[PDB]
Amino acid sequence: PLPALKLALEYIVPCMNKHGICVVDDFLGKETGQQIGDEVRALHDTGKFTDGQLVSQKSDSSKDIRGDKITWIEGKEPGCETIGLLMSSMDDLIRHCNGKLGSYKINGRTKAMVACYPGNGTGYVRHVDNPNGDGRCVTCIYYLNKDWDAKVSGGILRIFPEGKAQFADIEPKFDRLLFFWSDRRNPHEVQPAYATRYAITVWYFDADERARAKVKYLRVEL
Ligand SMILES: O=C(O)CCC(=O)Nc1cc2c(Br)cccc2cn1
Ligand SMILES: [Mn+2]
């Protein structure tokens, strides 16, 4: 990589505090990024993903249109070792940011949500990742698509930063890491993808929000 600390202190912290959206290119390098790509493609090829989000439910069921496919990855599974390394590297970054990302104190994360857009013209509608205060404060996405050309293949992640009249368009480029605030500051969508598009997402939890979300959404026997 490039030292997690240099990346965090000189780019990720100031850019997150200023814009709420931060892009790091060439995060792990070609050899590691390619190993991750190999692992994700292996998962896909061996059937570990779901069939995909039901986008249009037709009268017939062979005609149904399915979109983003997913699998949850802990990073310790056999054949997911390098995914685990990515997750450790994301954690290292976040660790070096803590106390500096807004007023958040990050104390945990989800497992990795690995997504595959099959390349059938499906995307992902505009949404907010954490609209209801469930404790997720930062979304972290790693992209693995070598030689992606959005003009040909689509698949741009378009973010609609609150209060600004502008789009932030992020191509799902190989070895690119994206951070953005998970709440309503950053509604976003994925534009239709016409080639197979892979991404690995982790969400980091703010300790306080997560603690009260547990109060909100809920046990010991008497
Ligand atoms: O690939 C990218 O560029 C990011 C795409 C993205 O926004 N994925 C995503 C998936 C979700 C699912 Br599945 C369930 C609930 C919330 C979700 C929020 N976001
Ligand atoms: Mn999202």
PDB file of C-alpha atoms and ligand atoms in Angstrom, residues 127 129 180 188, ligand 2:
ATOM      1  CA  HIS A 127     -30.987   5.755  -1.379  1.00  0.00           C
ATOM      2  CA  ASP A 129     -27.270   3.938   3.588  1.00  0.00           C
ATOM      3  CA  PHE A 180     -18.314   8.659   2.555  1.00  0.00           C
ATOM      4  CA  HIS A 188     -26.420   7.902  -3.835  1.00  0.00           C
TER       5      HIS A 188
HETATM    6 MN    MN B   2     -25.476   2.531  -0.605  1.00  0.00          MN
END
